[PDB]
């Protein structure tokens, strides 16, 4: 954990989080985000810190995927990659919904 000693499950690109373009990196036990062309992740959340997950449909000028944490905080991920947004939006959702039941289990 913390260090780059974990495998990457999914690498999403041109993912804008908080109006800034970066990349969405899915990890074995957590989800992280880092701006485009960067090596230092700015956001990191373990699948056990995620309470709920929502998914913003197509139709907007921005496609999104958000994680509602038990703390009340919410991390909405905007897939601004015209070429893989929709496709990666599902890929992340899929991995998340599949990983969540493995980490999410503590009556909270």
């Amino acid at each position: 954990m913390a260090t780059s000693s974990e495998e990457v499950l999914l690498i999403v690109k041109k993912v804008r989080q908080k109006k800034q373009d970066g990349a969405l990196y899915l990890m074995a036990e957590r989800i992280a985000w880092a701006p485009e062309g960067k090596d230092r992740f700015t956001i990191s959340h373990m699948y056990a810190d995620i309470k709920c997950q929502k998914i913003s449909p197509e139709g907007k000028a921005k496609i999104q995927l958000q994680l509602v944490l038990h703390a009340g905080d919410t991390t909405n991920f905007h897939f601004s990659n015209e070429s893989t947004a929709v496709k990666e939006r599902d890929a992340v959702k899929d991995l998340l919904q599949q990983l969540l039941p493995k980490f999410k289990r503590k009556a909270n």
């Binding site: 908080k18 309470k51 709920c52 998914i55 913003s56 909405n76 919904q97």
Partner: peptide, 22 residues
């Protein structure tokens, strides 16, 4: 919000998991 955060135009989701909290 205070600035131009995500809720600038966002809360039209399908909340994949809005029930279980186990």
């Amino acid at each position: 919000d205070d600035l131009m955060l995500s809720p600038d135009d966002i809360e039209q989701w399908f909340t994949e998991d809005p029930g279980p909290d186990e």
